[PDB]
Amino acid sequence: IRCFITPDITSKDCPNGHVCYTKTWCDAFCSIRGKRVDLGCAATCPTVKTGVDIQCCSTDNCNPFPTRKRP
Amino acid sequence: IRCFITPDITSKDCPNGHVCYTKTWCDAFCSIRGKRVDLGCAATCPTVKTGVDIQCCSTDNCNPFPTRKRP
């Protein structure tokens, strides 16, 4: 599967993963900027720590930057 | 944790779950309406079938209707 991977901006091939993921969380700047976001690919929908939020898909290239940083 | 649960519109208490989840997928009407969405609470971030997309959080009430139906 091909997912967008942070920090790169072009879609990467990931032969061993099955989902595309977006992870968003807030810093002191949440309101003025938006959520911080980390884009990747995984074998499985990854585990969240309290306060971080995750989005998982399994369509090629389905993890582009969210806008607000979740939506 | 308290999550929004479909079809109800008021936040429900879920003593045994740890995440709030949003699941979205498309039907023939995707473009004119938006994604179909199912809201719930879980012990863990649930497993996706190809083409369905999932969002998981662990803050009280963090799973309200998405708008577009993912964003």
Query: At which residue do the structure tokens 């963090």 appear?
Result: B62
Q: Is the dihedral of CA A37, A25, B64, A2 positive or negative?
A: positive
Closest CB from A47, A51, A55 relative to B53: A55
Domain that holds residue A27: 1-71
Q: Nearest Cα to B57, choosing from B16, B27, B18, B15?
A: B18
With tokens 């032969």, the residue in question is A15
CA distance A53 to A30: 14
The number of residues making up chain B comes to 71
Among the partner residues A48, A62, A70, nearest to B45 by beta-carbon distance? A48
With tokens 């900027």, the residue in question is A33
Contact B57 A66 (CB under 8 A): no
Total of domains in chain A: 1
Cross-strand partners of B4: B11
Phi, psi of A22 (to 5 degrees): -125, 135
Whole-Å CA distances, B42 to A11, A53, B5, B18, B49: 31, 14, 11, 6, 16
* Rounded Cα gap, residues B69 and B71, in angstroms: 6
Cβ–Cβ of A48/B67 closer than 8 Å?
Answer: no
Tell me the C-alpha distance between A5 and B26, whole Å.
25
Chain B residues with CB under 8 Å of A55 CB are 53-56, 70
> Is A52 in contact with A44 (CB distance < 8 Å)?
no
Q: Which residue of A has its CA nearest to B70?
A: A71
Question: Does residue B42 belong to the interface with chain A, where contact is any CB pair within 8 Å?
Answer: no
**In terms of Cα–Cα distance, which of A68, A55, A6 is closest to B23?**
A55
Indicate the residue of B48, B53, B55 with minimum beta-carbon distance to A53.
Answer: B55
Rama region for A70: left / alpha / beta (φ>0; ψ in -120 to 50; rest): alpha
Q: Is A13 helix (H, G, I), strand (E, B) or coil?
A: strand
DSSP B15-54: TT--EEEEEEE--TTTTTT--EEEEEEESS-PPPPTT-EE
Read off the tokens for B62: 């963090």
- CA-nearest of A5, A64, B61 to B22 is B61
B44 is written with which tokens?
A: 């863990």
Residues 6 or more apart from A11 whose CB is under 8 A from it? A2, A3, A4, A60, A61
Q: How far apart are CA B21 and CA A6, in angstroms?
A: 24
**3-state secondary structure (DSSP) of residue B42:** strand
For chain A, what is the largest distance between any 2 Cα atoms, rounded to a whole number of angstroms?
Answer: 38
Q: Which amino acid appears at position A20 of this protein?
A: C
Q: How far apart are the CA of A27 and the nearest CA of chain B, in angstroms?
A: 15
The structure was resolved to a resolution in Å of 2.4
Nearest residue in chain B measured CA to CA from A70: B71
Instruction: Answer whether the bond into residue B46 is a cis peptide, omega within 30°.
Output: no
CATH code of the domain containing A25:
2.10.60.10
